[PDB]
Amino acid sequence: TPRVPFLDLKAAYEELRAETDAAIARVLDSGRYLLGPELEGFEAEFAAYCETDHAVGVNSGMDALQLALRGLGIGPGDEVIVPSHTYIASWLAVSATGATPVPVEPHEDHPTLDPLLVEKAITPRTRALLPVHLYGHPADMDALRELADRHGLHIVEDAAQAHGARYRGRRIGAGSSVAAFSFYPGKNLGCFGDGGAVVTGDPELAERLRMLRNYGSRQKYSHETKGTNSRLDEMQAAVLRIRLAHLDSWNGRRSALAAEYLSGLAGLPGIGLPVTAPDTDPVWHLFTVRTERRDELRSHLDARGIDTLTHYPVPVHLSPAYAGEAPPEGSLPRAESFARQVLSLPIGPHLERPQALRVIDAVREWAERV
Amino acid sequence: TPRVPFLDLKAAYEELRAETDAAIARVLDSGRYLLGPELEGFEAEFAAYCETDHAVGVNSGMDALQLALRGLGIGPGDEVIVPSHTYIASWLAVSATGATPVPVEPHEDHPTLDPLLVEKAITPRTRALLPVHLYGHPADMDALRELADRHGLHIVEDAAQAHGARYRGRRIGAGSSVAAFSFYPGKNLGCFGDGGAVVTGDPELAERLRMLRNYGSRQKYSHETKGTNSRLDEMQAAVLRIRLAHLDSWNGRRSALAAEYLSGLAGLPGIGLPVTAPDTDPVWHLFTVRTERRDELRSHLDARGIDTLTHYPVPVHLSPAYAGEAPPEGSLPRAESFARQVLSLPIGPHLERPQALRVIDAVREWAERVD
């Protein structure tokens, strides 16, 4: 009867209703709604969660990336290697600093930056690499780091889709990393509105960020540098604190589901599945499949009362937004292929097994018929 | 004794505790947190409130200004006349577009852009005028419009401290206006986090704005244009709807307190009282007095257990953020003078008469001291 929802947000509030309500009531009653104890508590907790020393809360994953770059001196004339395969914000953030986004294709087997391709894209104007741990899968960080070192580049990770994921046993955002996260409601760790953060081991970068996000000031009405307004609300921070506490458990639920999908969709002719890189603990922000006749598969599922989505329908390079400025069509085949064949299957910490089985059955069904 | 607070934010929540809590619960139960019915509802109401056709909720007053400018095609190589006397955000939004902020002094006695001075700063690079209705006082819109219309400049108003004010009987942001507002907790119209909006009578601008605040999208995943993320949460918007229904009333309270101060502090030696330009209905975001020896007066009130604030202690041009690109100290005397003379006295829809009365007494006392 009822459809399989793509991702149930309300279920996330439902599960922790009492604590959530109390957290909000608390904020409401504090009389402090910006840059207070909730933000400070969350930052500390998140940073620790991430196995690093600093966290700076902001308004969105897009701002975190932008401010991270700006904070590393990134600007006009600079080149930033970005994924040709990712959510547009990745590029926009770069574009926002005046810098130039230079797309690099994903590895042939994993939706992350291909390091060898990366190397070949590096030019004398390159100043930073911007790997995206797409769908909750970590990019080959050791290879990226080697490259960056060897070439004197910074590394800003787009971890908006990988909260709590591990790379070779270390969380994404650990140590000397510089990673941007999104707290958008639908992210693996979400709140009740827009939010984001930058995590880093660098106390200096951290401080620049604190100024950056707050009108370039550390002291009221003391504008030492040009800044903006990109803060994480206390109210949102409060909830985030609750949710963080449940992140590994929630994440584990997705992993189970992912294991279910992998086995249950194994063999299917014409249906490509995700190949987890070794030495990694992905967080399955999205469970993706690939096929020719993706459109037909979606309709089929739709018709079967299954909610689906495509991440993403148009490759960044081909969006009107960047059209006249990025590589021509056919010049980024992998991102292009992804756009035509990819489909996201319901997944989340509130999806019941029976519903995942329904999904599987319907996929097999279609797969089989075609 | 208990100090007199500068502006009590809790009191705002308290007064509407029940409605508030329920507006929030409602959002929580909706399963809808971004770009929903509360946003739409608040936009319609606000728009109607400002006597205009559209309202586009964003993340802050700065983004409102920025996005408006962007939407009007303002950018690099362009010039936007800004007030030398204002909150930094006004300049920052201009710079953010790659355009250039060109400071123009305010009147000598009114914290707004001096129309007479504007004209002279106009360059072939000029594209817009960015007047600020500072402290809840409207700038001279008629003059500015006239000026704009002549030179074919756009006008983007910084109305973050002027929610509901009227100029010539019309609300700030009415008709063909293009005005940006802030919903920052401490504004006349605030919420429990950051937020803002742009109001305009232009459907096309409005649509551009919706797209700009939402990744250059009108359809999910269809990036028609370059955009950003600058939205007003459902949760905050629910609250604003309530606050909005009490704005007139709350502003009204501010106006009573203003009258009191004005009457209560009349004829005081070195105390400069805020002037209310004719044809204006101010909303007194802030109550400002000016004096030489402001730090003294400040220390004095502090001693009398009264919280005050200075808006702003350092003129924009003199801030390190722009020091390097603005005019040198001494070349923007009005702005420089405001910065060294201003003091904000407690005011808000939650301040009580007796507290205001003590503010009055301390100020008088001070002013009457033997010299």
Ligand SMILES: Cc1ncc(COP(=O)(O)O)c(CNC(CCC(=O)O)C(=O)O)c1O
């Ligand atoms: C990889 C990646 N980077 C950056 C961002 C931007 O983060 P925000 O905090 O959401 O601004 C997203 C959000 N991806 C989204 C959410 C889009 C939105 O905010 O409207 C998505 O793909 O639906 C993302 O998935």
Ligand SMILES: Cc1ncc(COP(=O)(O)O)c(CNC(CCC(=O)O)C(=O)O)c1O
């Ligand atoms: C005249 C004016 N313009 C623009 C802004 C910026 O709007 P926001 O939504 O607050 O970004 C403010 C906020 N004035 C502030 C609040 C500064 C802040 O946001 O931290 C003030 O002067 O304290 C303002 O007063």
Ligand SMILES: [Cl-]
């Ligand atoms: Cl606050």
Ligand SMILES: [Cl-]
């Ligand atoms: Cl939502």
Ligand code: NA
């Ligand atoms: Na926000």
